Design a binder for this molecule. Structure first.
Ligand SMILES: Nc1ncnc2c1ncn2[C@@H]1O[C@H](COP(=O)(O)OP(=O)(O)OP(O)(O)=S)[C@@H](O)[C@H]1O
Ligand SMILES: Nc1ncnc2c1ncn2[C@@H]1O[C@H](COP(=O)(O)OP(=O)(O)O)[C@@H](O)[C@H]1O
Ligand SMILES: [Mg+2]
Ligand SMILES: [Mg+2]
Ligand SMILES: [Zn+2]
Ligand SMILES: [Zn+2]
Ligand SMILES: [Zn+2]
Lengths: 438, 207, 668
DNA sequence: AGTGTGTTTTTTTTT
DNA sequence: CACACACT
């Protein structure tokens, strides 16, 4: 079947090489793109696969866990065929597959005991992101007394992990092949946790969360507190309760449920056009009043108030003097007046307009560490620094409710932080200082 | 099932002397003693397997009425003398005999102690009838056999880690690691040392 | 007759004729005869009907496309009962037989319904005896029995290996799939290829997976004798059965008394104790009311399409609104305006959202001021059980954290965990509030915050979650000294803050006035309540029933259950829309609202008050049950709101203001 | 003689 | 990883 598996690999490469639309082989296009910018990753649509050949897609659906490594090997061979001259391990890193399903999404809630090791399509909001964790793409070992050195290329497509080599394998022992972690090649992995569909609101049910894993060209794409529509195989491994194992997902494709673009690295997705009309609106002074009126729908007036709001959201420029000093850019607007006057409503609207910061309330926010709370980590008795609201508000225009109702003493600690535009903490013997651009 | 013998428990009532929390010395082992303990915490009902069966599939033979002292114990070998196996035995749960047990501990009362001694707690063995007979949270007058209870995890049985004191020579029941004890009492009989507002019930029950 | 797979008469099947009952049942000959009888009565035995109710459940579950196959355990003893006793003694094997017969019935009623569920479960509802955890004896072991417990854990539902294939590392690449009890590891420890012991590993070949959910149980303290700690027996939920409950909801279920081993228990006990489990073959909740069949099974309440047709028929009937006003809390004589307010709060306004983000609450916050002993708590109790989803706030008992949003440090999991905020429990349903005028002020501000957005936002202990709180709330308050002074301004009659009364859309005040003949009627009414309440009095119960029927005729013309189903129908299908409206009528209304707050007895009138009037109009229209708001129903909403405002005023200005608004009052 | 298995109060933080 | 026990 290994020859049959190679034949299936050949069939998949025949797919990618001879799938075109209007003479355009999009797959070789993205291939050469990922050659020019060396991202060893490939994106494919299963609808295209079905159109070219149902059978290969069905074989995929039967057991994706081992079909995917064959596809990665096929893509790597294809890249070797195309981007490398003919007759010219680890010489070319393997490409990894990216898939978009567009099928139905079973809710995170009501996931069956069935669908084990089955590709699934879902959506949820991230509550936590793990740091990167390398994974041995290639493994370098030596047979200890036998001195035999061998290569291993383990894929993350099983279950849990492959046990270390046993016996001499051409007594040298139950594990002579001592891993020499220099030639061995690693790729980082990141673990993810999705809350179940905040819109689903299962009444009376605590939102269940599942763990995920991401590959080097999938990791760090999105942040916690952001909803993502995911397409990854349903995954199971043993945590260390009979015949019950940890449920998780190995992701084959990442799509943003919030749909918001990633951290803006100044790459203009709006491009020159949209910014050109933006400047035209800036060129036309009337558009200033347009933005004024547009803010706070149904407010019926208060236009100069809306102008002040627009100016504040617009962001005061922080100038860094050549001196040790630095002109303070951001400002914090104070809202005093009679109740029932849409003030909190306007605050919520403004925060919805600009999500660079987060709307909160005084009582809802923890009195201690409003800017940044200090919490004891479950696995470290040291009270770590947890990012408070103005940590999140840093880099963002933030609206908070019930200032008067809040206890005054910690609000004193807020004025200093906003004044310095940072957050200086020396509590609990920890002298960390964090910026507060809000 | 009726043919299968129903186990015998013989409870002793009206015993001459009640030793109470006092007495209970080491010299007496397996001795009938009456104690006026104040048992206020008791325990939960526990199945307390008496006898059981073993598969030993690779001999295909079946034990009858395996008895273990305190720790789950298997037959010395396969029931068949052929394929006698000291390595493997598997439970057959066929001769399963159980006695509902409750590890009732007695804390001594305030009276009858001269100098403020703490409410010394002694666990007491209880039987299914006795468990239902005993009402928890209540000081009880009880009697039964006083047995020597060994400490836990001491046996070298599989699963439970053997508890790795002084010992005799010439024994071979447990040649290594010795053993330690924590005695508990067994009460054959227990009694407490210390509505119906219906017209028909009133008329019938009332004198 | 056959040694295995036999058919015999029912009598020879019944008697074991063997030393061991379970060994006799173990004979596959006996099993096959039982299978024949099982298939026979499954469809052939049509108890009390021309059709087999079990056959009716067949292909209905097929239509439901599920796996449970409820039996009810009745029509089994009724059907010659030998199978019934056999099950009650040695279930597991004939449960498997029931699964087989389910297979044949499956493909019979619905061909191709096979391979949809590879198995079809047994669901033994009901039992001769309810039993107790205190009742669990060695006899009860390995026997399915009904129980009386309280679910506590509800662990995360986990797929579990229905089949397991154990293979040794050296010899067996793949070994045959054998069933796994899910209670303990099979641990064969023997290789077919290697006679000697070797390292064993699970087979990579896929086997069936079933759900797994452990729940701790607890004996009902009321049934438990005083001073006795209820026992706690573990029960595991399985596939097609997990996530049936809520922790602490408490159920009675019939399940086999599983018994398992664990060396740690013997170690901590020093004795050959054997761990005991149950996993109910069928699940049904015990809500504790045991009033009717709703107690049996899960949850209570119902919805009927015939009932909604009746609701439509009464809706086109005029005077429905007044009947509903009489309908709400009939056991509280008088309080016509109060009844109107609470009933329309039950109906609630229509939620409104602007641009996706901007939103208007569809829930009504009733502020009530009541003298002590004015049925306020009992009014709340009548309100609940009528709006289905409901909560009760003791007021003083709850706090800022407790009611709105709570986080609980969880030592067992080792992280901070969310604790159920009672206002989150309020969300999606009506919120009862009592003793609020006496409870903590910081908690009051927390409630203000929570209600302003109809959602609670909490960021502490690493939990930054925000929970929607859609709940119609009704605060209960006592006047300063328990008696409202009409000459006194409301704010002076109120010991609480001004902002809270502003955010409250409905204000309610209870006062003691001369009302002599009314006090005659009220005392007589309470006497009647006692008399109908007394079991001692066709018979006495018949005359109690007829007197409550006639009182239902005068007030609450719709039955209370019919009433609550009417409310459910209104929420579910009725959504009146303001398509037509009177702009300038509302304009002049708010104009008059102005220059009145200048009065010392007058609280400020704001925009949110106008939104309150709008949502009161929505609640009235929902109460009218029409999918389109009526202008004149909206007019009655205006009338109710303006009357509440006038009552809120000082009596001195109140008369001048009522004359001023008289130009509005007549239109109603 | 097989081969298996075990050792690294305080202090904020709520409130 | 690697060395005292309990039989292997
Ligand atoms: N000028 C206005 N135009 C439109 N709507 C208004 C206006 N003034 C008040 N409102 C409405 O009245 C509501 C009351 O405001 P809220 O959003 O509850 O918060 P707020 O105005 O800050 O009230 P407090 O001070 O927190 S009680 C608003 O949501 C609006 O819907
Ligand atoms: N109009 C009424 N009709 C019937 N019962 C009434 C009426 N007004 C008050 N009650 C009775 O008053 C009692 C006190 O109710 P509750 O709300 O607990 O009083 P409090 O005013 O002290 O909060 C209730 O048992 C209720 O039946
Ligand atoms: Mg506000
Ligand atoms: Mg009350
Ligand atoms: Zn070697
Ligand atoms: Zn044997
Ligand atoms: Zn083998």
């Amino acid at each position: 079947n290994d020859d049959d598996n190679t034949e299936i690999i050949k069939s998949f490469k025949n797919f990618i090489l001879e799938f075109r639309l209007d003479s355009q082989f999009i797959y070789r296009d993205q291939l050469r793109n990922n050659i020019l910018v060396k991202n060893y990753s490939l994106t494919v649509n299963m609808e295209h696969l079905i159109g070219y050949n149902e059978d290969i897609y069905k074989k995929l659906s039967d057991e994706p866990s081992d079909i995917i490594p064959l596809f990665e090997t096929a893509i790597t061979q294809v890249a070797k065929r195309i981007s490398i001259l003919s007759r010219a391990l680890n010489s070319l890193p393997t490409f990894q597959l990216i898939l978009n399903s567009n099928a139905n999404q079973i809710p995170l809630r009501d996931l069956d005991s069935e669908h084990v090791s089955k590709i699934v399509r879902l959506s949820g909001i991230i509550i936590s992101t793990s740091v990167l964790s390398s994974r041995a793409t290639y493994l370098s070992i030596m047979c200890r007394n036998c001195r035999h050195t061998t290569s291993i290329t383990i894929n993350n497509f099983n279950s849990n992990t492959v046990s270390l080599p046993r016996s001499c394998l051409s007594n040298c022992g139950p594990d002579p092949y001592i891993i020499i972690h220099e030639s061995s090649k690693f790729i980082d992995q990141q673990f993810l946790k999705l809350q179940e569909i905040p819109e689903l609101v299962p009444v009376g049910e605590m939102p269940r969360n599942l763990t995920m894993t991401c590959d080097r060209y999938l990791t760090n794409k999105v942040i916690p507190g952001t909803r993502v529509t995911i397409v990854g195989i349903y995954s199971i491994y043993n945590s260390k309760g009979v015949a019950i194992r940890t449920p998780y997902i190995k992701i084959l494709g990442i799509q943003s449920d919030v749909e918001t673009s990633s951290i803006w690295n100044s790459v203009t997705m709006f491009t020159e056009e949209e910014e050109e009309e933006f400047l035209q609106l800036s060129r036309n002074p009337k558009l200033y009043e347009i933005l004024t009126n547009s803010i706070a729908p149904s407010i019926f007036g208060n236009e100069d108030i809306k102008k002040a709001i627009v100016c504040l959201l617009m962001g005061g420029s922080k100038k860094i003097l050549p001196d040790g000093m630095r002109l303070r850019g951001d400002i914090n607007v104070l809202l005093l007046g009679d109740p029932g006057t849409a003030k909190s409503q306007l605050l919520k609207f403004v925060e919805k307009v600009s999500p660079i910061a987060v709307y909160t309330s005084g009582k809802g926010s923890s009195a201690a560490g409003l800017t940044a709370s200090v919490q004891r980590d479950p696995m470290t008795r040291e009270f770590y620094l947890e990012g408070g609201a103005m940590v999140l508000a840093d880099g963002g225009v933030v609206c908070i409710d019930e200032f008067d109702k809040m206890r005054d003493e910690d609000r004193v600690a807020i004025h200093e932080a906003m004044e310095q535009q940072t957050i200086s903490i020396a509590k609990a013997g920890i002298t960390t200082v964090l910026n507060s651009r809000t | 099932p009726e043919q299968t013998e129903r186990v015998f428990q013989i409870s002793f009532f009206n015993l001459p002397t009640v030793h109470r929390i006092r007495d209970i010395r080491s010299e007496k082992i397996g001795s009938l003693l009456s104690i006026s303990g104040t048992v206020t915490r008791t325990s939960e009902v526990r199945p307390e397997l008496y006898k059981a069966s073993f598969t030993c599939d690779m001999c295909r033979a079946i034990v009858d009425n395996v008895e273990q002292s305190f720790k789950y114990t298997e037959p010395t070998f396969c029931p068949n003398p052929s394929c006698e196996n000291r390595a493997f035995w598997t439970l057959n749960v066929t001769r399963s005999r159980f006695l509902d047990w409750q590890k009732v501990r007695i804390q001594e009362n305030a009276n009858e102690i001269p100098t403020g001694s703490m409410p010394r707690t002694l666990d007491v063995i209880l039987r299914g009838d006795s468990v239902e007979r005993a009402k928890p949270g209540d000081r009880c007058k009880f009697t039964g056999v006083e047995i020597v209870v060994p400490d836990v995890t001491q046996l070298g049985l599989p699963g439970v880690k053997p508890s790795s004191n002084s010992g005799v020579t010439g024994l071979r029941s447990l040649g290594v690691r010795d053993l330690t004890y924590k005695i508990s009492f067994l009460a054959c009989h227990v009694i407490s040392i210390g509505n119906e507002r219906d017209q028909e019930v009133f008329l019938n029950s009332l004198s | 007759i056959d040694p295995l797979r036999e058919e015999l008469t029912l009598e020879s099947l019944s008697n074991v004729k063997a030393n061991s009952y379970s060994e006799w049942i173990t004979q596959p000959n006996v099993s096959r005869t039982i299978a024949r009888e099982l298939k026979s009565f499954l469809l052939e035995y049509t108890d009390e009907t021309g059709r087999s109710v079990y056959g009716a459940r067949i292909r209905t579950l097929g239509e439901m496309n599920s796996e449970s196959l409820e039996v009810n355990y009745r029509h089994l003893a009724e059907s010659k009962a030998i199978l019934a006793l056999f099950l009650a003694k040695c279930p597991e094997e004939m449960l498997k037989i029931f699964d087989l017969v389910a297979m044949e019935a499956t493909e019979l009623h619905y061909p191709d319904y096979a391979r949809i569920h590879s198995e079809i479960h047994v669901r033994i509802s009901d039992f001769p005896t309810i039993y107790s955890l205190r009742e669990l004896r060695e006899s009860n072991l390995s026997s399915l029995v009904r129980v009386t417990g309280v679910v506590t854990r509800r662990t995360g539902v986990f797929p579990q290996l229905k089949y397991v294939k154990f293979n040794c590392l050296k010899c067996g690449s793949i070994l045959g799939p054998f069933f796994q009890d899910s209670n303990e590891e099979i641990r064969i420890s023997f290789c077919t290829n290697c006679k000697s012991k070797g390292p064993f590993r699970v087979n990579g070949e896929k086997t069936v997976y079933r759900n797994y959910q452990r729940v701790t149980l607890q004996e009902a303290p009321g049934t438990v004798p005083p001073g006795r700690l209820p026992r706690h027996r573990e029960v595991i939920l399985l596939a097609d059965l997990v996530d049936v409950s809520k922790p602490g909801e408490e159920v009675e279920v019939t399940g086999i008394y599983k018994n398992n081993y664990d060396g740690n228990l013997n170690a901590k006990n020093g004795f050959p104790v054997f761990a005991t489990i149950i996993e109910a073959n069928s699940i049904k909740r015990r809500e504790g009311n045991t009033a009717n069949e709703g107690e049996e099974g899960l949850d209570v309440f119902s919805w009927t399409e015939e009932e909604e047709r009746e609701f439509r028929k009464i809706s086109r009937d005029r005077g429905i609104i007044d009947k509903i006003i009489s309908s709400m809390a009939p056991s509280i004589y008088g309080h016509r305006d109060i009844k109107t307010a609470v009933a329309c709060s039950l109906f609630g306004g229509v939620p409104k959202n602007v641009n996706g983000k901007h939103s208007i609450r569809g829930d009504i916050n009733v502020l009530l001021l009541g003298d002590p002993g004015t049925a306020k708590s009992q009014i709340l109790k009548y309100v609940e059980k009528t709006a289905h989803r409901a909560v009760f706030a003791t007021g003083q008992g709850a706090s800022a954290v407790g009611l709105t949003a709570s986080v609980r440090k969880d030592p067992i999991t080792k992280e901070w965990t969310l604790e159920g905020g009672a206002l989150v429990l309020a969300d999606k349903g009506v919120c009862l509030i009592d003793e609020f005028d006496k409870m903590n002020d910081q908690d009051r501000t927390s409630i203000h915050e929570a209600m302003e957005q109809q959602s609670i936002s909490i960021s502490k202990a690493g939990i930054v979650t925000t929970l929607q709180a859609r709940c119609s709330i009704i605060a209960a308050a006592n006047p300063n000294g328990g008696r409202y002074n009409s000459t006194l301004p409301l704010a002076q009659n109120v010991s609480l803050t001004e902002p809270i009364l502003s955010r409250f859309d409905i204000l309610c005040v209870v006062r003691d006035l001369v009302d002599e003949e009314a006090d005659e009627r009220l005392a007589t009414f309470v006497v009647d309540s006692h008399v109908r309440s007394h079991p001692e009095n066709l018979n006495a119960r018949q005359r109690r029933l007829q007197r409550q029927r006639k009182k239902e005729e005068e007030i609450s013309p719709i039955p209370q259950e019919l009433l609550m189903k009417y409310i459910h129908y209104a929420r579910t299908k009725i959504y009146p829309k303001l398509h037509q409206m009177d702009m300038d009528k509302v304009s002049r209304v708010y104009a008059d609202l102005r220059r009145e707050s200048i009065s010392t007895g007058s609280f400020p009138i704001t925009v949110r008050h106008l939104e309150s009037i709008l949502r009161i109009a929505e609640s009235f229209a929902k109460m009218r049950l029409s999918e389109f708001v009526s202008s004149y129903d909206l007019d009655r909403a205006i009338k109710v709101v303006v009357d509440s405002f006038v009552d809120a005023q000082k009596v001195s200005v109140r008369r001048q203001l009522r004359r001023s608004f008289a130009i509005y009052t007549l239109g109603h």
